[PDB]
């Protein structure tokens, strides 16, 4: 597949979309065949040449002066261990990463993207603007504080938190629920049609949530909606 | 020919070379019998078990005893069959080792007695009984809340000093009395003083006349510690294969069997498994447990005590062992110190047979109601510890009133306990105890004092005791 | 005075419940840690065994 | 001929391989050219693997190995009494050679299931807490477990010293300690007079791993001689953890695969073989007995460790020493809550048994109510009984170093504690009260002491009470 | 042949035929279609075998062949299962393949392939087949035994490197064939046993990564009266909507 | 260094002090040498001969009739873990132990010796 994409990049100078369904299977098959080639085992059972073999393939997927290739790769994490060598060594080969979590999947908040572990190199004030950057950083800070508060909430009760921490929890639960979305391809699983939300709408909605405008709405009204308005109509349908 | 010689000795592992075309089969027994030719030798009488065929007419074997004194080139003779141990009436009341040699001082069994191979394929799919049947132990709690199954495996858990040995003796007594069967005890990898104490306890109780014992304790080599379970198991198999009886088989610690298997695999040189166990752990557990089954003419049911390393039930050995258990009983030290005997934790004990299709709708309903009442009383004790008895409603008062009598009625007088209680024992039918518990739940005996239920057999004995008391 | 006594009793019961909850969390976390580290130990043993075999 | 001689073809890490030795026996002792001993462990097809029992730096490839014709064994006999010796039977204190004329193999079968008898004879250790809470009988194997510097060695030395007038032979095995520490232990034993019946086996940290692995087995072999002659023997193992470390070293050098937690798979078998040889013999085998006190060191009191769990599963009981109690001034540091002896209790004397029950209840009650001492209240439920009696019990259970006391005196003092005779005495004066009471007994209670010593039972209660009151009359509180 | 290639991309069709198991907790929110593969995962004594037997029994009035493969089960348990099938009338269309725990590891490793090969005949004749694998975990244990007996280096949890390939090769062969291939289908219901409900273990994750959804049965819910013990959070059906009738989907 | 120190007591009867910079690095070097020689690793990757090497080093530091050698040794503790084999195996050879705390160091209290954890016979 990469050989085809490389020709389309070079010999015609055209923009190429490259989707790889699971790049982990390449290294998995390499590890499976390594033992019969006379190589000694390394790390938890992987081949000694794990890094070089991965690099030789990954470095060919790049944008050049005569053509740009944007590639989206799904990477499988064995046993949900992010410290496994195959997921670990492939982190350095990516510009933007999104990490999914089974904990978020169990809660029903799809696409279950981890808001903290997910990183990108385009999140800079000179690239997305201060308006976007401040909102993103504030959302991350609030979510981190809510994550930290879990132990003290569990072992002391909700009523023992200060009015600042109570407001932090109140905002963070709504933000976490609003991070969920209904997908077009998800219509086969649930009857909801799905939606497409522009970046301006997302930024405005999250800024309004952070400003405290929607503190009176119920928590579940924010789950699986599009723009911030659909929260209002969902609350009205529920009877506010 | 049938004669070979030793070429390698490495601890318990011995390699024996035979003539071409005359190798012994796997699991066969080889005998080494040597007399010291001069002052630099010692007398040797050792038995080996064939494990692998290494090629070049060489066989790798494991010894059943210490190999010290062996010299390369000693003659080895093949018996042409696996290890054989005596079976029949002669085994009852005796104590044996892994090789079937009597440890007691009563004398050796004559060579004309019947002997059966230790290794045997499991009974076929045709031979097994198509019906699940309940083994009536005669103990009220076991028959009510954790019923046993003919051909089933039961795990026995409890702390020290709670009465596991007394319960074992009572089970043997009840089975040999009512069902006409016998019992076999195999204490694998445990304390020699504990085995001696158990022997003396059986001799005191008179149970020893109906049981056979094989020990192969901790000091024994791993091969003996692994094959003691199998020799006891085949001694148990004989009685139900020929005479068609129901037989109890007791294993003091099944974990030591797997540990000895792991040690033997390490000696053989096989690559260790996940947590250092042998790769054949599940397989060996299969050949061991699959022979304890119920068939069309008899059954063997086994009571096994299982050690859990580091209290982790997810450890591979407990995980493999638990896949075969059909019931579980837990001895409870709090009940023991409270004075309830047997103290077998009615809430914690579980059984697979406790279903309406197997034990009956009425029995299942009575058991579930008793369990719910006991759980409700357990919850209520916390509120008692906080507010006191008087604050609870009359419904809670009635629940406590019923629960105390139920818990006391769970106790029973054992036949073996007479030696230090004076009172004789009693055998309670399952229908009788179900009827008694149903009548107690109906409130037909609420007016009686709670102490009349303390330690009693059938429900009629309860009212007789109350009438005699006052 | 009665309100002060009630306040002291409420603080008593609240702190007792907090200690109970914290001890429950301690037990659960210690169990999780002990179950977790043995897997790493066994993985190290497996790596040693494989390295010895490969030579 | 190459049948009785051989040549070394490989040397490394204390392990050697030799060509030849066609008639060598498995487990035999072999002799090198320079006099160093060795064990024939693996009889491979064309060579023999030898474990070197000494300094292997003097052995080169190509030197001759001499056969000895004897399975490994150690010298035994009464001539070993009062000497410190290595695991191979070679003296290390000088004083000339040991002139024994009998040997016994190191690896021997344990007594059979029909050769044993129930334990029924008390073992007086001279420690109040041990003799009260966790009684030990002759033939029992009791584990002593604790952290570093918790007094395990002190307890062992006190127990050994207390056997001065008892008809018991003591064997002390030092495994992996400092040679200076072993020397100091020997000096204390000589000063207190315990060398008249004590054999000391030493294997310092500088010695090769096989010597550390073999030392306790040599001690058992020495003890079994007196055991089968009808005598009573006490054996103390100072580091089963260091034995396990040495055996793991040897196994790894032999390239055997590791087992659970990097220890060899048969680390349980190693300890079971050693501890299973202590028993009480039946009358058909004579009245002899052997009792063992293995030692295990924990990490921050982690009882759930692999070696502590194995030794607990093997032994008949445990005695736990706590570092916090040791630091808090309770030098005995015995935790009565976790310590337990299960074979013991039947061997305890009647007089001591009649008071141990009350002592246990008082100490236990104090042990769940000490933490509430931040504010003493609730009257008798906390203050007058639980806080007072428990503190006095803790005061009386303390004991000075190397001062064991007779069981009769222990019975007297603990009866005085339990019957409330110490309720008026302040806590600071309790130890002085006990010390003066011992002298008052030695001066005026010979009848009571003789009655207890001859009947193993308490004397007349009225006479005992009047004697205690008579003593309390003369005591001055300060 | 035991080793046979799986149907290709162009030999398959989208799943559109519901498989009614007769259980509300499955048919409502974890639908199963013909040609789908759906594992039942949970701790021991949770009702997985009961669910499988009820699913087999419910197919009495439909023209579909059922195959029950027992891997590592007790012979008495297999005998009782066969007796229940005979009582309820499922033996008229059911094939039982057994490999008890006393059998050697090769037979345990080989049994599921024998079952799927038996089902392939009816699938390619144009009929519908349902296949049940009773312990893929025990199959994996037997394969690990064999691999370490062959001295192949062990990976995570001492399992061989091709442990994922072992299960994927078997489970990938169940498919819904197209009209050109005859419209046959093979439905697979593999089983995985977890330890203390740990769904993050290597074998459970490997088997989940292959199939089209999982039914997670929780012991904490099996106790305290919720007998089906369906865990909606951890359960999912990847052929949802299409595997239901219009009313139930609505 | 030990060989250089032993002379002043063996041939002159002096009382000598021997200072060792770090025993942890000595154990690390021993483990590296064992790995180079190809021996199977110990508990956490150390050499199987760790205890024997420790005993061989420490046992020569003793007091005799002619003189004595007292030794002060600094022990590094990786990640506060005192259960690590290198800190653990050296405890059996020490007469007195001194513990230093970064918590006390940051407060400005030097030498930052913990007054409750330090022990001496
Ligand atoms: N049915 C009973 N009735 C009365 N007392 C009993 C009964 N069963 C046991 N006991 C008491 O409990 C004690 C413990 O009995 P036993 O030795 O059988 O327990 P155990 O749990 O097997 O012990 P251990 O694990 O220490 O070997 C008995 O000595 C007796 O005093
Ligand atoms: N009852 C006691 N009274 C006074 N000092 C005591 C008492 N018991 C022990 N000690 C002292 O406490 C210290 C503990 O040393 P000891 O050798 O007895 O302990 P250990 O637990 O065996 O430790 P180690 O691991 O150092 O061998 C010694 O200085 C000893 O003299
Ligand atoms: N829906 C149900 N209602 C009532 N009882 C049920 C139900 N489902 C299962 N059970 C009962 O639960 C028990 C265990 O069920 P089952 O044997 O199917 O479980 P399993 O997970 O396959 O067990 P194992 O690991 O022993 O093979 C049986 O007694 C069965 O009768
Ligand atoms: Mg018992
Ligand atoms: Mg000491
Ligand atoms: Mg099942």
Residue numbers in the entry:
A (entry chain F): 232 to 471
B (entry chain E): 1 to 470
C (entry chain G): 230 to 284
D (entry chain A): 24 to 501
E (entry chain B): 128 to 377
F (entry chain D): 232 to 352
Can you list sentences taken from the study reporting this PDB entry?
F1 domain of ATP synthase is a rotary ATPase complex in which rotation of central γ-subunit proceeds in 120° steps against a surrounding α3β3 fueled by ATP hydrolysis. Upon dissociation from the Fo domain, the F1 domain can catalyze the reverse reaction, i.e. hydrolysis of ATP driven by rotation of the central γ subunit inside the cylinder comprising α3β3. Here we describe catalytic intermediates of the F1 domain in FoF1 synthase from Bacillus PS3 sp. during ATP mediated rotation captured using cryo-EM.
Two 120° structures were classified according to structural differences in αTβT. One 120° structure, termed step-waiting, has a more closed αTβT than the second, termed 120°. The difference in αTβT between 120° and step-waiting is the result of movement of the CT domain of the αT subunit. Thus, sequential structural changes occur; a structural change from 101° to the 120° associated with the 19° rotation of the γ subunit, followed by closing of αTβT which occurs between 120° and step-waiting. At high [ATP], the F1 domain of 120° and step-waiting were composed of the αDβDHO with ADP and Pi bound, αTβT with ATP, and αEβE with ATP. Step-waiting comprises αEβE with ATP, αTβT with ATP, and αDβDHO with ADP and Pi. The first 80° rotation occurring via step-waiting of rotational state 1 is coupled with structural transition of three catalytic dimers, αEβE to αTβT, αTβT to αDβD, and αDβDHO to αEβE.
